[PDB]
């Protein structure tokens, strides 16, 4: 995941404030920050005066300081605030545009942008054009992955996929195949897929007539809530209107026909930020249609099905004869070796199975779950909540094809005496952060938690 | 065989022996053990003295058995002669009379295991020939003996009796269905049948 939040902080500060002028964008980005930062920001928003950092330290206690650093580093990186070495101290305060926009949003501000929606006869039916948006999303997914017939006419969308290198397909020969990007597209279920596509449209649509402030205004206004009336008609910039038409083509806009009307708020824009339920001629009833198969016997038992879904399953398992409720497929080392040929790591698939194919594995994941977390301290043996056997077999296939070991962290030095090194090693063993250590070299390559805690203890 | 070892491990055995005094002693110890904790088994003879007068109440009897069906002609022909007289003097054939006597003794044995209606208890039999005699039995025994309970194997027998014992153990005391089969004090008889004077 490119972690669009990282792209957000990527952009410079002045354009960040340019975006913060739009209160709805302020709210939407408030939705994204880690909870610690959320709470701290909500504290600061009202008392119109900077605050010393010492208070914001003493606010948090023990065994939870890691999140303090997470929040402060994130917020500084995206520069929502302005640290102030006023008297040599730290006089924190938000980018005041952010503060005022947010406060306006909380109590009836002047955000005509966020208020761009119009209330009228929302003749849009729940299934009404919702099925059409779902069908468009399925069509583009199939065309990108490659179906027997790809009716994907998104010439702009195809150009974005190709130039963006969305999938390892020979666009010169017209191929739309799964690359590392294609593997990720197979991985990111909904939010991941929509996010990758939005980032691709951003990167491709970045040359001329961008108006990035208007771009994000339109995007978040779409994700915020149903603008409905007068959206497409009134509430859009010129380039904003063009981007809206393009998104509506991309499915992310459920604009009605007649090419001129209010905004058509498809559920997809909601899906962009919701991180919630995923379900979308005139028939389609399934809260658990996807009937995948995955047990301890490493077999594929399917009753429920979805053609693109089962094709995704086939992307790492053989197909011989499609059946009524089943499809001939058995997951083996060869089955995942198919994706290993694409170099697909046995990592995304883990959480994928934990999440996807569950419409047919609800009872399976419940019996594996068994609520064996509160019962874990008492009964020390887990009831295969997340199947470890399958994980071990997958790791074995991955190991069979790999043979290389790597570690994260950074090399450390200036352990002048053996006493500091030994005490830090003991503390790390207490906290389980030392990958490896040696007093002879006074060096190691681990996470920064031990150094952080020692420095905090020393300075304060 | 070792068969007796197991029943020893569970309950008590109290055999029936020809001398009457020792028999009485054994029988009373059987009662004393039943009302005590340890379960106790008394095995006796249908023709024998035990079945004649001794009673078997709630505790003292749960599951009678009838290993085989009692018949006499094991021994000599005095029965043959009397039966000859029977056939010539009364229009009764041999096997008819023999079956009649056998079921007489069988019913006499079986009836002992109940005293009131609060009491209860299994009453098994055991022989191939029993299945056709189901009509020879006294009526009130026959009623409880439904058709589906015929020539059962031992295994289904144990299943059924287990279910019985459990079910009867329940305090199934609606006390309003007992106004049907108890005709309570001075009234339900009075009311019901003083009206039934029809």
């Amino acid at each position: 995941k490119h972690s669009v939040t990282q792209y957000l902080e990527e952009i410079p500060q002045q354009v960040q404030n340019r975006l913060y002028t739009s209160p709805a964008t302020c709210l939407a980005i408030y939705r994204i920050l880690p909870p610690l930062a959320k709470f701290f920001i909500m504290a600061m928003v009202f008392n119109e005066n900077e605050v010393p950092l010492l208070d914001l330290d003493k606010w948090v206690n023990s065994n939870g300081k890691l999140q303090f650093q997470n929040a402060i580093k994130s917020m500084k990186s995206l520069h929502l605030l302005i640290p102030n070495k006023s008297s040599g101290t730290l006089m924190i305060n938000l980018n005041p545009t952010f503060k005022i926009s947010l406060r306006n949003a909380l109590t009836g501000g002047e955000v005509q942008n966020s208020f761009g929606v119009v209330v009228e006869e929302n003749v849009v039916s729940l299934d009404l054009l919702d099925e059409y948006s779902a069908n468009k999303w399925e069509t583009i997914l199939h065309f990108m992955v490659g179906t027997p017939l790809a009716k994907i006419p998104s010439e702009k969308v195809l150009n974005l996929l190709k130039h963006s290198k969305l999938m390892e397909e020979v666009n010169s020969t017209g191929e739309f195949k799964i690359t590392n990007e294609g593997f990720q597209f197979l991985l990111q279920e909904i939010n991941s897929q929509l996010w990758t596509l939005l980032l691709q449209y951003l990167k491709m649509i970045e040359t001329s007539k961008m108006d990035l402030v208007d771009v994000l205004h339109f995007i978040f206004m779409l994700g915020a809530l149903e603008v409905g009336k007068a959206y497409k008609i009134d509430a859009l910039s010129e380039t904003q209107r063009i981007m809206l038409q393009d998104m509506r083509d991309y499915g992310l806009v459920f604009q009605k026909h007649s090419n001129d009307s209010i905004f058509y708020p498809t559920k997809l824009a909601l899906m962009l930020t919701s991180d919630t339920k995923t379900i979308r001629g005139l028939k389609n009833q399934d809260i658990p249609d996807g009937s995948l198969i995955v047990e301890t016997n490493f077999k594929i038992y399917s009753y429920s099905n979805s053609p693109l879904q089962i094709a995704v399953l086939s992307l790492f398992v053989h197909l011989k004869a499609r059946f009524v409720n089943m499809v001939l497929g058995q997951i083996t080392r060869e089955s995942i070796r198919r994706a290993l040929t694409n170099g697909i790591t046995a990592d995304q698939i883990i959480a994928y199975l934990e999440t996807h194919a569950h419409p047919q594995m609800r009872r399976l994941a419940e019996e594996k779950l068994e609520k064996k977390l509160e019962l874990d301290p008492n009964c020390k043996e887990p009831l295969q909540v997340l199947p470890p056997t399958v994980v071990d077999q997958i790791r074995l296939w991955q190991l069979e094809l790999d043979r290389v070991i790597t570690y994260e962290g950074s090399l450390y030095s200036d352990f002048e005496t053996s006493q500091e090194y030994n005490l830090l090693s003991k503390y790390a063993q207490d906290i389980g952060v030392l990958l490896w250590k040696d007093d002879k070299k006074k060096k190691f390559f681990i996470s920064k938690e031990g150094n952080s805690q020692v420095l905090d203890f020393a300075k304060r | 065989m070792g068969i007796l070892d197991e029943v020893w491990k569970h309950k008590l055995i109290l055999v029936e022996t020809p001398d009457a005094q020792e028999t009485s002693l054994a029988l009373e110890t059987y009662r004393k053990a039943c009302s005590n904790g340890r379960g106790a088994i008394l095995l006796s003879v249908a023709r024998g003295k035990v079945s004649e007068g001794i009673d078997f109440d709630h505790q003292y009897g749960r599951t009678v058995l009838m290993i085989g069906i009692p018949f006499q002609y094991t021994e000599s022909r005095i029965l043959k002669a009397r039966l000859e007289f029977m056939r010539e003097n009364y229009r009764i054939r041999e096997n008819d009379f023999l079956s009649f006597d056998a079921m007489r003794h069988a019913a006499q044995c079986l009836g002992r295991v109940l005293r009131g209606k609060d009491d209860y208890g299994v009453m098994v039999l055991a022989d191939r020939r029993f299945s056709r005699k189901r009509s020879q039995l006294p009526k009130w025994i026959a009623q409880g003996l439904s058709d589906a309970d015929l020539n059962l194997s031992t295994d289904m027998a144990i299943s059924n009796t287990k279910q019985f014992l459990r079910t009867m153990a329940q305090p199934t005391d609606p006390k309003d269905q007992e106004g049907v089969s108890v005709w309570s004090y001075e009234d339900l008889i009075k009311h019901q049948n003083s009206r039934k004077d029809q």
């Binding site: - | 039943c34 904790g37 014992l165 153990a169």
Partner: protein, 351 residues
């Protein structure tokens, strides 16, 4: 078609204080295969549940646990008022496996010895979870039963799948004759509810007995943290309570002061008692066609009332089970919840 208790006819007295001495059964019988793991494992699990529950609802009582292995009664938890000790003891047992025959007589005698110190106002009790179909006594039993009833010691037992004559005699004997306490089970859920109904105090129709005022005092929490110091376990504990009279620290509990020996409570225990003393009238199920009342809930706001003429559906019933004194409706969920968890009737509170 209803399954309700008609009326409660001892809503005047219960044994609020208790000293219940649960006695399990760990003997070769409990190893048969009728309950899912066995008799024994399921038994101990439910025993843990019952321990938690009972020490909740009767938070002023004590309890002791007794097993019956190899014909011996081996105390596995002194009579004590701290649930955690008993919980741990049961934990320990559950990993150990039964043997020998259940010696009901020995367990009974050990209990009768055990409950001697319990004072007059406190009430005694035992709860035999008898599993087998026999006993093995080293003495007369009716002797013991007579001694028991002489010492005013009610006993309730929960047989497994049978009825044993002596146990029936036992329950009928100690409980002032009135036989209702030998309930035996026929299903696991029946077993859960068996323990549940064992939790509550136990009235039948109490003989007029001595009723006695009991001295006790309430503590006040402590403040300091580093001054950690304890007078009931002789440790350092970052802060606890003070006996109002003995005036010595005591680790958190409703326990008895370990210095001047008077009972300690806050009040919430007394509040639980109050809840048990004077419960509500059982909520009535309103007539199907004669109600003509509001179409909602009252405590909650549910939309489950009727359907208005639907051949058989409306002919079924009208979910309006409505309490008497406040005479306000309540959907089934609300009535179940009121009569189970919180006993302040919503409407009957308000007037």
């Amino acid at each position: 078609k209803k399954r309700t208790a008609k009326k409660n006819i001892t809503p005047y007295q219960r044994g609020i204080i208790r000293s219940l001495i649960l006695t399990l059964d760990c003997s070769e019988a409990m190893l048969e295969k009728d309950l899912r793991p066995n008799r024994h494992a399921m038994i101990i699990q439910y025993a843990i549940d019952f321990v938690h529950e009972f020490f909740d609802q009767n938070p002023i009582s004590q309890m002791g646990i007794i097993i019956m292995r190899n014909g011996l009664a081996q105390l596995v938890s002194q009579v004590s008022g701290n649930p955690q000790d008993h919980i741990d003891a049961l934990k320990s047992i559950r990993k150990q496996e039964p043997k020998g025959n259940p010696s009901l007589q020995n367990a009974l005698e050990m209990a009768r010895g055990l409950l001697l110190p319990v004072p007059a106002h406190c009430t005694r009790e035992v709860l035999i979870v008898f599993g087998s179909l026999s006993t093995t006594d080293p003495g007369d039993i009716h002797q013991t039963i007579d001694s028991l009833v002489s010492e005013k010691i009610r006993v309730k037992v929960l047989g497994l799948s049978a009825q044993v004559a002596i146990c029936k005699e036992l329950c009928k004997a100690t409980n002032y004759g009135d036989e209702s306490f030998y309930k035996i089970l026929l299903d696991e859920t029946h077993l859960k509810e068996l323990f549940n109904e064992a939790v509550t105090p136990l009235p039948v129709n109490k003989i007029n007995k001595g009723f006695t005022l009991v001295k006790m005092g309430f503590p006040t929490r402590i403040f300091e943290d580093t001054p950690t110091f304890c007078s009931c376990h002789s440790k350092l504990v970052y802060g606890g309570y003070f006996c109002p009279n003995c005036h010595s620290k005591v680790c958190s509990l409703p326990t008895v002061c370990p210095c001047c020996d008077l009972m300690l409570i806050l009040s919430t225990h007394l509040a639980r008692s109050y809840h048990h003393l004077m419960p509500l009238k059982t909520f009535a199920e309103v007539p199907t066609t004669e109600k003509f009342r509001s179409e909602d809930c009252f405590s909650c706001q549910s939309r489950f009332p009727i359907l208005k003429n639907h051949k058989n559906g409306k002919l079924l019933t009208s979910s309006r089970y409505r309490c008497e004194d406040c005479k306000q409706e309540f959907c089934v969920d609300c009535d179940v919840f009121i009569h189970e968890i919180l006993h302040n009737c919503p409407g009957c509170e308000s007037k």
